[PDB]
Amino acid sequence: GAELPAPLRRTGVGEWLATTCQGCTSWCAKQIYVMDGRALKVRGNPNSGVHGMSSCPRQHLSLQQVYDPDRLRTPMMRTNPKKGRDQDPKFVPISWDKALDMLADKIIALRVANEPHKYALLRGRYSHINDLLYKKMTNLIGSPNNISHSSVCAEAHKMGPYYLDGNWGYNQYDVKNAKFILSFGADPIASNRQVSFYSQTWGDSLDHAKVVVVDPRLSASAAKAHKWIPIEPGQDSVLALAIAHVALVEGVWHKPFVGDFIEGKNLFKAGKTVSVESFKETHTYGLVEWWNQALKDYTPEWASKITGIDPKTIIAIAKDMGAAAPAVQVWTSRGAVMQARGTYTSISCHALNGLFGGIDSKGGLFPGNKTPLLKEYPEAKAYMDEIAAKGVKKEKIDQRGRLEFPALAKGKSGGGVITANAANGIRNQDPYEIKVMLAYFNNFNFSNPEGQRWDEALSKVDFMAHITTNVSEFSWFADVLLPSSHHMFEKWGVLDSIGNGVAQISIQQPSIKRLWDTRIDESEIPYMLAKKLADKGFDAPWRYINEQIVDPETGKPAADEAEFAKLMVRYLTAPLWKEDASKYGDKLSSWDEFVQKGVWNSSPYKLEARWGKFKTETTKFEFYSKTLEKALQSHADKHKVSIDEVMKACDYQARGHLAFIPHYEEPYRFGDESEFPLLLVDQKSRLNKEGRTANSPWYYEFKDVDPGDVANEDVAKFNPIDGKKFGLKDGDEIRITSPVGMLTCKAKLWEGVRPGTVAKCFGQGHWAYGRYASAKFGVTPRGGSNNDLIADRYDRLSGASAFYGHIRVRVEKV
Amino acid sequence: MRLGMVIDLQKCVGCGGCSLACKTENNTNDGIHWSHHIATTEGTFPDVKYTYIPTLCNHCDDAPCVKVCPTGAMHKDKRGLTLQNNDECIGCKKCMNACPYGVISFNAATPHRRWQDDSEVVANGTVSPLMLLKRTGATATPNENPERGDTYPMIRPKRTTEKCTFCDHRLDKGLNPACVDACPSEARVIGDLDDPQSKVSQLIKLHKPMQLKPEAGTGPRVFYIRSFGVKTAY
Ligand SMILES: Nc1nc2c(c(=O)[nH]1)N[C@H]1C(S)=C(S)[C@@H](COP(=O)(O)OP(=O)(O)OC[C@H]3O[C@@H](n4cnc5c(=O)[nH]c(N)nc54)[C@H](O)[C@@H]3O)O[C@H]1N2
Ligand SMILES: Nc1nc2c(c(=O)[nH]1)N[C@H]1C(S)=C(S)[C@@H](COP(=O)(O)OP(=O)(O)OC[C@H]3O[C@@H](n4cnc5c(=O)[nH]c(N)nc54)[C@H](O)[C@@H]3O)O[C@H]1N2
Ligand code: SF4
Ligand code: SF4
Ligand code: SF4
Ligand code: SF4
Ligand code: SF4
Ligand SMILES: [Mo]
């Protein structure tokens, strides 16, 4: 135990290798420290322009994922032909060649029978090399059913940005220059999409920004904010609309962006209409129409009656935002908008970003910077045979585009995925049966609301293969398991991130020798499957790969699996390192320099870039969304109904012009409030790497970094008022029941919970995944599975699943 | 020389990244965390305050753990750190009762015993803790950091105590403590409190410093500045 002499000391002499973390869609650039062939540490990549060395705490849990003792080391096949929660699959090990043979035989049988559309590809997480496995392979087989997870993620959060300013996507928030931050449910030092960077900056920003957090629970961000507004779930838009109302009455919209009355005098008087011709809008459209049709009556008193918020607080917030403009940013979280009528909460909250001029402004918010990363491999039309051309025209299994499922992504009827509804199409064989399914990086039985519907659906699929590191809940229903090399340590990939005024592109690369007999989901596996299909007489995918996915420097196809894995990344990133990317950001001299740095950074965002040229119908920032009217009109015309009939069929309250402006939709609620007196407030753990750290012991050891939670436990948090009402004490074993299901967990009394609600982290309740994540693997869960409580409901205008606002529950001691 | 740390509570977001970094750096057994925290919730709804205070060894000026140690295993070094010759620890636990802060842990459990399990959740399909140990070449856990062994056992023996060493092995190489490097907001700063020009010396002049349990008379050298929360507006 003597200290080692200097020549034999080991501190600091190991190797740092660049990769990318995917614990959340922050997608931080990382370096991995390697010594004795083992990954020992993770840090933020110092070359990153978004976040630098800053990181959230979950980077360290990555090390218990790659070295998870319940990872699969071999392909497997089930030997119990029955599937179900009660059916042990009795998996036995097989070779890759045998596993892909079974899958290939089933795919080819579909084509021979002229039913290629009965194939489905399911995608959970992914990297930007996904186009081959997700889209090209699927369409070449002849199926339209490439089903992402986007609608169980955040599609409703894109409705406001798209239908108001043309951005079907996320924003970055300029916190370093903000003077007012208003968060509707966002908790950016714990979740959302740059936890590393917003954690870096949040505390410092409190010295120049006033911060208000609107959330039914006291989140970490609210605990470090100037005001916590404990909103009743589903009432966010009431506050957003009343703030806008006060802004107009007080005359404190941002005139350089919005415009002004022609004669100077502010004519917005509460309750009274204004002449449209009296106002000259600059970069916006529809302000007076919005006022005349609804906003003139969304007074602070109206809002206080619904929410209990002091009207003086509403007025003070509106005035503070007016004085801070344009250095004003409004965040929306999933909690505010992933509700059955949530499209109009996204619109109502995001409208404030236009009203106070924050959109594309200093201290405001704006989209990701332009980069030259390619996102698709070459077109495959020339490789489509007649079977495939017919199949890809079939209705999608998720029923997108039907009257009651407009899913208006990017303005198109049926434009968006409806992930959770694919289970309903499958189990009802409507539009048709799914007979062959390939799925990767996903666990929809656990992550989708009312996931037992996925139990039911998958039990009815003739053949399914799951590409996964662990035997998760979804894997339980697979015929074949195809073990994936771990995305962060054993894979070639590429991702991007936005924040700090920049967009970055980062590499994923293997940092260790491959541990087990696994293959990379998005490159090696489709390559091997294409070879197997070609051996069996269907060579279109193989020809597509070998003729179109060739090296950007040599023009040669990959010689083998390992080369192909790297080639997939080289191909899409060639504009960064083979060509001169100086016009967009960094100049990289070679592929090797890109790999060594591990990240490419854009130049800083040009403020006001989009002013006067939004990708909306008017090219303006639309308070009256002609963009959404055009999309709804298209959907209505498709189904030979009026727009009002669309609204009625999709269970929105809006009629007439209200369908196109920010307005109040009463939140949808399910269940009798007398039997189910509490509203569920679902939240993420700040130690969740999505649904993937429940088999990491360090997760449990530090679980109380979630404010109010308890180490090594799964707790539901009740206000002490409700604890007294229901006879609950800390540590009591409890059952929580909704109209659709139940879970068991433990009780915690916490004053940071709005009375009448119960705040509980999603992430526990696994009955599979591994030995730490479950009580008895395959049988008994650890903790309680939130989504068993959440009825299968949709924001039908976006396709999004609802996880918030509508869930009523009751509680009792077990 | 009196090395110490200043922690800025306004910058701190209460994420535990420092404590997880310590786990990866120092190979502490499951349940043993040299870096930890004290969190408090105060007030009745809706006027609720939550605060998180990161904690570690305070490397005290007048360390009672050193004074009571019967073997001399616990000792001060020339940097002012409280370090331990683990080889001379007899597991008497006197240090733990003397320390006012509860930052010392006792290895009653065999460290990393959960990695000796060779059961598989799916037989001949998934792996096992023991198999992962064999595959990676590690001795006790695939997550063990060999650097730790420069100055302290990489894996401590049962029936010894252990605590934060201020990442002495990293300081010896001119590097930063793992928890300092791990902090996203740079809330943690270390330096020589005897140097008036050090960043730590200047921080506690620019801001009013606070210490945990100064009344215990140990002269702790972790100082807290500013506030985790802010006063409510409106
Ligand atoms: N730690 C962690 N961070 C992550 C992820 C993760 O898994 N773990 N996933 C990433 C991904 S994929 C996503 S899509 C983003 C999502 O990031 P966000 O969209 O910002 O939201 P969530 O993290 O899902 O948190 C939902 C929050 O809404 C609150 N809330 C619940 N109901 C209501 C309501 O009715 N009104 C209001 N105002 N609030 C309500 C909950 O308390 C919770 O704080 O996070 C990314 N960041
Ligand atoms: N109640 C509630 N439900 C939610 C959320 C919430 O906040 N509350 N968050 C929702 C959100 S925002 C999202 S985006 C969705 C995400 O939901 P999903 O896309 O279903 O993602 P996960 O649940 O993380 O499942 C990923 C699965 O991939 C496997 N896998 C794990 N690691 C790897 C790897 O490295 N490679 C490969 N090929 N496979 C791997 C495992 O089977 C793992 O279970 O969950 C959502 N569901
Ligand atoms: S978990 Fe998310 S925020 Fe944290 S380091 Fe990984 S990608 Fe970044
Ligand atoms: S890493 Fe930094 S911000 Fe996170 S808890 Fe530790 S000191 Fe605070
Ligand atoms: S904090 Fe405790 S263990 Fe550390 S030096 Fe002070 S008395 Fe000793
Ligand atoms: S347990 Fe070890 S370090 Fe502590 S007082 Fe006893 S001999 Fe000294
Ligand atoms: S200084 Fe080193 S040993 Fe001490 S808490 Fe920080 S990481 Fe752990
Ligand atoms: Mo998501």
DSSP state string for A757-793: EEEEEES---SSS-TTTEEETTTEESS--GGGSS---
Q: Got the DSSP string for B94-130?
A: HHHHH-TT---EE--SPTTGGGG----SSTTTB--HH
> CB contact, 8 Å: B23 with chain A?
yes
Rounded Cα distance between A726 and B210, Å, is 41
- Cβ atoms of B204 and B15 within 8 Å: the answer is no
Closest to A99 in 3D by CA, of A85, A113, A127, A78 = A78
d(CA A623, CA A652): 19
- What is d(CA A171, CA A164) in angstroms, rounded to the nearest whole number? 13
The residue among A552, A589, A555 whose CA lies nearest residue A569 is A552
For residue A396, what is the DSSP state?
P
**Residue A197 and residue A504 in contact, taking contact as beta carbons nearer than 8 Å:** no
Q: In what order do the strands lie in the sheet with A180-184?
A: A227-229, A210-214, A180-184, A328-332
Who contacts B61 (Cβ-Cβ below 8 Å, separation ≥6)? B2, B80, B218, B219, B220, B221
Distance from A204 to chain B by nearest Cα, in Å?
Answer: 6
The answer to whether A500 and A29 have CB atoms below 8 angstroms apart is no
Strands of A278-350 (E only): list them.
279-281, 284-285, 328-332
Question: Six-digit token pair at A657?
Answer: 């012009």
- Is the distance from CB of A540 to CB of A383 less than 8 angstroms? yes
Beta bridge partners of A812: A735
CB atoms within 10 A of CB A812: 12
Look up residue A352 and give its amino acid.
L
User: Which positions in chain B touch A471 (Cβ < 8 Å)?
Assistant: 121-122, 125-126
Name which of A317, A733, A750, A243 is nearest B41 in CA terms.
Answer: A750
**Host H or E run for residue A511:** none
Residue A24 marked in a binding site: yes
DSSP single-letter state for residue A157: G
Do the beta carbons of residue B86 and residue B111 sit within 8 Å?
no
Q: Which of A160, A327, A158 has its CA nearest to residue A240?
A: A160
How far apart CA A646 and CA A386 sit, in angstroms, is 36
User: Nearest-CA neighbor of A66 among A482, A440, A491?
Assistant: A491
Query: How were these coordinates obtained?
Result: X-ray
* Three-state DSSP state, A812: strand
Chain B nearest-CA distance from A471, in A, is 8
How many whole angstroms separate alpha carbon B194 and alpha carbon A278?
A: 70
**Angle, helices A311-324/A300-307, rounded to nearest 10 degrees:** 120
Q: Is B212 helix (H, G, I), strand (E, B) or coil?
A: coil
- Nearest CB to A57 within list B16, B33, B175: B16
The span from the CA of A221 to the CA of A229, in Å, is 12
For chain B, say whether A264 makes contact (Cβ under 8 Å). no
Q: Which tokens in the block code for residue A331?
A: 């965040």
Say if residues A523 and A126 touch (Cβ distance below 8 Å). no
Q: Is A35 on the interface with B (CB under 8 A)?
A: yes
**What CA–CA distance (Å, rounded) separates A601 from A47?**
8
- Is A704 within 8 Å of B229 when comparing Cβ atoms? no
DSSP count for chain B of H helices, then E strands: 7, 9
Total number of domains constituting chain B: 1
Residue contact B13–A189, C-beta within 8 A: yes
Q: How far apart are CA A226 and CA B229, in angstroms?
A: 8
Is residue A521 a contact partner of residue A546, using CB atoms and an 8 Å limit?
A: no
Distance CA A689, CA A443 (A): 13
**Conformation bin of residue A671: beta by default, left when phi > 0, alpha when psi is -120 to 50:** left
Count of residues in chain A = 814
Under a CB-based contact definition with an 8 Å cutoff, are residues A494 and A506 in contact? yes
Domain of residue B180, residue span: 1-234
- How remote is the C-alpha of A108 from its chain's centroid? 34
Run of H or E including A337: helix A334-337
CA gap B54, A46 in Å, rounded: 24
- Residue A446 to residue A448: CA distance in whole angstroms: 6
CA–CA dist A10, A502 (Å, integer) = 37
Helix (H, G, I), strand (E, B) or coil at A17: strand
Separation CA A282–CA A145 (nearest Å): 43
Task: Tell me the pairing of strands A757-762 and A678-684.
Answer: parallel
* Alpha-carbon gap, residue A740 to A804, rounded angstroms: 15
Write the CB contacts of A330 (distance below 8 Å, at least 6 apart in sequence): A182, A183, A184, A240, A349, A350, A352, A353, A358, A365
Grouping H, G, I as helix, E, B as strand and the rest as coil, residue B38 is strand
Both structure tokens of A681? 């407030």
CA distance B67 to chain A (A): 23
- Please report where in the chains the tokens 């092995």 appear, as a residue: B169
CB A123 within 8 A of CB A441: yes
Q: Residues near ligand 4 with C-beta < 6 Å?
A: B 12-18, 54, 182-185, 187-188
How far apart are alpha carbons A757 and B28 in whole angstroms? 38
Phi, psi for A734 (deg, rounded to 5): -130, 155
Q: What residues pair up with A8 in beta bridges, in sequence order? A: none
Q: What angle do CA A14, A18, A24 make, to 5 degrees?
A: 125
CA distances from A9 to A211, A241, B189 (A): 48, 63, 25
- List the residue whose alpha carbon is closest to atom 4 of ligand 6: B95
Give the span between the Cα atoms of B101 and B34, in whole angstroms: 12
A563 Cβ neighbours under 8 A, 6+ residues apart: none
With a CB cutoff of 8 Å and minimum separation 6, the contacts of A1 are B85, B86, B87, B153
Nearest ligand atom owner, CA of A30 = 3
What is the dihedral angle through the alpha carbons of A332, A208, A282, A353, rounded to the nearest 10 degrees?
A: 0
Structural contact between residues A39 and A26, judged by C-beta atoms closer than 8 angstroms = no
List, in sequence order, every residue forming a beta bridge with A210; answer none if it has no partner: A180
Q: Which of residues 35-74 of B touch A (CB under 8 A)?
A: 37, 39, 41, 43-46, 48-52
**Reduced to 3 states, what is the DSSP secondary structure of residue A217?**
strand
**How far is the C-alpha of A268 from the C-alpha of A245, rounded, in Å?**
9
Distance of CA B227 to the CA centre of its chain: 21
- For residue A649, the surrounding DSSP H or E stretch is helix A643-649
Residues in chain B: 234
Q: Are B17 and B184 in contact (CB under 8 A)?
A: yes
- Resolution for this experimental structure (Å): 1.7
Ligand 8 centre and the CA of A154: distance in Å? 6
Chain B residues inside the 8 Å CB shell of A204? 10-11, 185
Radius of gyration of chain A (CA): 26
Q: First vs last Cα of chain A: how many Å apart? A: 52
In A, minimum Cα distance to B132 occurs at A69
Angle at CA of residue A172, ends A626 and A660, nearest 5°: 15
Q: Are A563 and A468 in contact (CB under 8 A)?
A: no
Please list, in sequence order, all residues whose beta carbon lies within 8 angstroms of the beta carbon of residue B145, skipping any fewer than 6 positions away: A35, A40, A41, B24, B25, B26, B27, B154
Query: Using CA atoms, how far apart are residues B114 and B133, in angstroms rounded to an integer?
Result: 11
A419-428 and A452-459 helices cross at what angle (nearest 10)?
40
Q: At what angle do helices A524-535 and A540-548 cross, to 10 degrees?
A: 130
Q: How many helices (H) and strands (E) does chain A have?
A: 26, 33
Tokens 């503070």 belong to A320
Please give the single-letter amino acid code of residue A789.
L
CA distance B154 to B86: 11
- Give chain A positions within 8 Å (CB) of B46: 228, 230, 754
Gap from CA of B84 to ligand 6 centroid (Å): 8
DSSP class of residue A519 equals: B
Query: Does the beta carbon of A362 lie under 8 angstroms from any beta carbon of chain B?
Result: no
Which B residues, 184 through 203, put their C-beta within 8 Å of a C-beta on chain A?
184-187
Question: Taking Cα atoms as reference points, which of A153, A199, A457 lies closest to residue A334?
Answer: A153
B46 preceded by a cis bond (ω within 30 of 0): yes
Distance CA A542, CA A540 (A): 5
Cis peptide before A326 (omega within 30 of 0): yes
Torsion of CA B127, B131, B137, B141, to 10 degrees: 90
List Cβ neighbours of A451 (8 Å cut-off, separation of 6 or more): A444, A445, A473, A785, A787, A788
**Residue B221 one-letter amino acid:** R
Interface of B with A in 137-156 (CB under 8 A): 137-138, 142-143, 145-147, 149-151, 153
Cα separation, B72 vs B87, in Å, equals: 11
| Among candidate residues A740, A678, A747, A748, the one with its CA nearest the CA of residue A707 | A748
Please tell me whether residue A39 adopts helix, strand or coil conformation: strand
Which residue in the block uniquely carries the two structure tokens 């370093």? A176
The angle subtended at Cα B167 by Cα B161 and Cα B169, nearest 5°, is 100
**Closest Cα in chain B to A705:** B15
Tokens 């007649």 belong to: A386
Inter-residue contact A448 to A426 (CB < 8 Å): no
Alpha carbon of A136 to those of A380, A383, A492, A555, A719: distances in Å? 7, 10, 19, 20, 51
Distance A235 CA to ligand 2 centre (A): 28
Q: How far is CA A636 from CA A118, A416, A617, A644, B131, in A?
A: 29, 16, 18, 9, 60
Which pair of tokens denotes residue A126? 């992914």
**Which H helix or E strand runs over B51?**
strand B49-55
Instruction: Consult the annotation and say whether A349 binds a ligand.
Output: no
Q: Which residue from A400, A316, A410 is spatially nearest to A628, judged by alpha carbons?
A: A410
Tokens found for residue A431: 């539009």
